[PDB]
Design a binder for this molecule. Structure first.
Ligand SMILES: C[C@@H]1O[C@H](O)[C@@H](O)[C@H](O)[C@@H]1O
Ligand SMILES: C[C@@H]1O[C@H](O)[C@@H](O)[C@H](O)[C@@H]1O
Lengths: 142, 142
């Protein structure tokens, strides 16, 4: 169905048991190194701090980080690449007690230990070289 | 006036005296490292070879390269950064006898010696984290 705006911004609250579900596809072939970025922000402003930064270079690598009082922290780099050239993906990001868990097409693929409480999140931004059909944050839990 | 599609693709021919003019703006603040990419391709297919690859990480750096029979060649990296945070830019790329010259807001900023004859170009693609208002290739010269 319908394409969502990219960059995509949604005001958001997160806590343990929250799930962020993203369905999209890369705009171009992996040879051209399309990117995907998901940022969990502390304010609606784009320049605000990032509790969780998740950046895919499709076909190549993923980096995760935080941006705290305007400054990037220690980068985690992964060469794990479950994403398939030319294919629609479903990303789900689960807020566990101790970490974010990133599922790609139902497969556990990345985790990132909380550096800031997930309750600090006020906004989620999904951007770079993708089309987006689905975005959901669950709000079912106390 | 009106926003052009991004990624932007135009069938193109280049030779000495050709100018490619691009007016656009970054989608987000430089702190979030928006990218710009301009690729001069040998075919309309996106996977085709790239005579001239020009990739800006806004606020940070520029890399130029070629992709020849599917394989990336020697990277040129520049820390020259005339692009201004939050501002509309005008990029012009001139085909000189021996190189591409990239003007940013009327200022000479990058050059890249021809590795393949500019006559090999069949397509220009402008993409990543920009909006586009103007794209022109000049066709005035023999
Ligand atoms: C400037 C920043 O450096 C950090 O270490 C990276 O994790 C971010 O992706 C960004 O490029
Ligand atoms: C895989 C490629 O490596 C080349 O050296 C770079 O110039 C391209 O931007 C791309 O990242």
């Amino acid at each position: 169905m319908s394409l969502l705006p990219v960059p995509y911004t949604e005001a958001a609250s997160l806590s343990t048991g929250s799930t962020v579900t993203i369905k999209g596809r890369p705009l171009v072939c992996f040879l051209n190194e399309p990117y995907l970025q998901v940022d969990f922000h502390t304010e609606m402003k784009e320049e605000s701090d990032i509790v969780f930064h998740f950046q895919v270079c499709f076909g190549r690598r993923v980096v995760m980080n935080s941006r705290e009082y305007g400054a990037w922290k220690q980068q985690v780099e992964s060469k794990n690449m479950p994403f398939q050239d030319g294919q629609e993906f479903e990303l789900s990001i689960s807020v566990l007690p101790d970490k974010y868990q990133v599922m790609v097409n139902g497969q556990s693929s990345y985790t990132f230990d909380h550096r800031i409480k997930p309750e600090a999140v006020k906004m989620v931004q999904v951007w770079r070289d993708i089309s987006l059909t689905k975005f959901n944050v669950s709000y079912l839990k106390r």
